[PDB]
């Protein structure tokens, strides 16, 4: 309804619209990050509405810069606004300081846009995993609708985020190879995502610590991961 204002707290101290924008993400496609010392792996169920969709077009993983990739879950259209902002801030950083923006600084700038709602009617119904490589090493951050940002070692957002945290608890350690991280990322998506896992059905990306560069895995390259599992 419209009876409660947008800027209204609940009796248990949570802003309602935020608490409801978070319920919008649990409907969304599953995404996840694995920070390994070799690099950071982003994976994403595409959840294509039909076979006829060009799956490349509805890309859950987005290049923010050479060294930072965002994966979204929840309202895709909204994420495009957040990632558009990350890109503008990333490039403003390069412009101004002649250096790649830190992953944390890029997360903070993305969350600067997410506070300003009253200008914008509602929060963004998107949670973003932002994974990159800077001086600090490979890092993985999550933005919420609240504007909170949380560094994670591994995190899943969206539908099977709850079922995937359970798998990370069991399997994730801090001295993983990028190869094992990719293996894990896909192993989880297989268990969690509703459709049968195909090379076209999911998106995988890594920012490798060694070159500091983002590689979006082609379907060929994702089949190579499924082949070793």
């Amino acid at each position: 309804e419209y009876d409660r204002g947008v800027n209204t707290f609940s009796p248990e101290g949570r802003i309602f619209q935020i608490e409801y924008a978070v319920e919008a993400i649990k409907l969304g496609s599953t995404s996840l990050g694995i920070r390994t010392p070799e690099g950071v792996v982003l994976a994403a169920e595409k959840r294509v509405p039909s076979t006829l969709v060009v799956p490349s077009s509805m890309s859950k993983i987005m290049e923010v810069d050479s060294h930072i990739a965002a994966v979204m879950s929840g309202m895709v259209a909204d994420a495009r606004i957040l990632v558009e902002h990350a890109r503008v801030e990333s490039q403003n950083h390069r412009f101004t300081y002649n250096e790649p923006m830190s992953v944390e600084s890029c997360t903070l700038a993305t969350c600067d846009l997410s506070i300003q709602f009253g200008l914008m009617s509602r929060p963004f119904g998107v949670s973003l995993l932002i994974a990159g490589v800077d001086e600090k090493g490979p890092q993985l951050w999550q933005t919420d609708p609240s504007g909170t940002h949380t560094r994670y070692d591994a995190q899943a957002i969206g539908g099977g985020a709850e079922a995937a945290q359970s798998v990370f608890t069991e399997r994730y350690h801090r001295n993983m190879t990028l190869e094992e991280g990719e293996t894990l990322a896909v192993d989880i998506l297989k268990q969690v995502m509703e459709d049968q896992l195909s090379p076209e059905n999911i998106e995988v990306a890594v920012v490798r610590a060694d070159d500091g560069k983002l590689h979006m895995y082609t379907p060929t390259e994702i089949k190579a991961i499924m082949s070793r599992m």
Binding site: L52, V53, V54, S57, M75
Partner: protein, 239 residues
């Protein structure tokens, strides 16, 4: 100005005002897009030949720029405003970068405008889904769909409006990748005929080829519709 929050989250995480804008699109007249090897075909249903509507030809598939055409489903009024916005953006883009704007570029612009309407205080969403076809200057054909949420996806074939999901479930059974200008047109009409009235007069359809947009004449069209409706009789006999 009036900047009350209109599009807001509900307990289940739903944006009701966007779900309702999509209810407006389901009520809207069916449109269909079919990507071929060298062709994009956009086919729309018309409300049907009332004796009173001006004999002079009004096209329900709108031209955004030389390269880019769009059909819509939903509120005629809202769609006119998006199309005028798109039309301006393509020309604002030619002004700022000599190049003609690619289809994918425009689609993202139109989808951004539709997103802004779901988050602008003071405004309801656009009650409009869009099918945008065209050819980039390079020669590659593009077919895109934009829904009221402002989320846009490229398709090989797509439907919007009434019984979109019936048409899409039908299309993905029969759709083949490499298709001739004639097979696309055939397929588009066959697909529209799944939901639209048996009548040939309601369907109006545009055939995009690199640098060549042509609407089928109702003479050219009734050949394809006869050939298709005899093939829909063949499929009725099989079942």
């Amino acid at each position: 100005s009036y900047d009350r929050a209109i599009t807001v989250f509900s307990p289940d995480g739903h944006l009701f005002q966007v779900e309702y804008a999509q209810e407006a699109v389901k009520k809207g007249l069916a449109a269909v897009g079919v990507l071929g090897s060298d062709s994009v075909v956009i086919a729309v249903e018309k409300k049907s030949a009332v004796k009173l509507q001006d004999s002079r030809t009004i096209r329900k598939i709108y031209k955004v720029d030389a390269n880019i055409y769009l059909a819509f489903a939903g509120l005629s009024a809202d769609a006119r405003v998006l199309i005028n916005k798109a039309q301006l953006e393509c020309q604002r883009f030619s002004l700022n970068y000599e190049d003609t704007m690619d289809v994918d570029m425009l689609v993202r612009y139109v989808a951004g405008v539709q997103q802004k309407s779901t988050q602008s205080g003071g405004s309801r969403p656009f009650g409009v889904a869009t099918v945008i076809g065209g050819f980039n200057e390079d020669g590659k054909p593009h077919l895109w769909k934009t829904d009221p949420s402002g989320m846009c996806s490229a398709w090989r074939a797509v439907a919007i409006g009434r019984h979109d999901q019936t048409v899409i479930e039908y299309m993905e059974k029969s759709y083949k990748d490499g298709m001739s200008r004639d097979e696309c047109v055939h397929f588009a009409i066959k697909s529209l005929l799944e939901v639209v009235e048996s009548g040939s007069r309601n369907i109006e359809l545009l055939v995009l080829q690199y640098k060549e947009a042509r609407y089928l004449t109702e003479e050219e069209l009734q050949k394809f519709v006869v050939e298709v409706e005899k093939e829909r009789e063949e499929e009725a006999a099989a079942k």
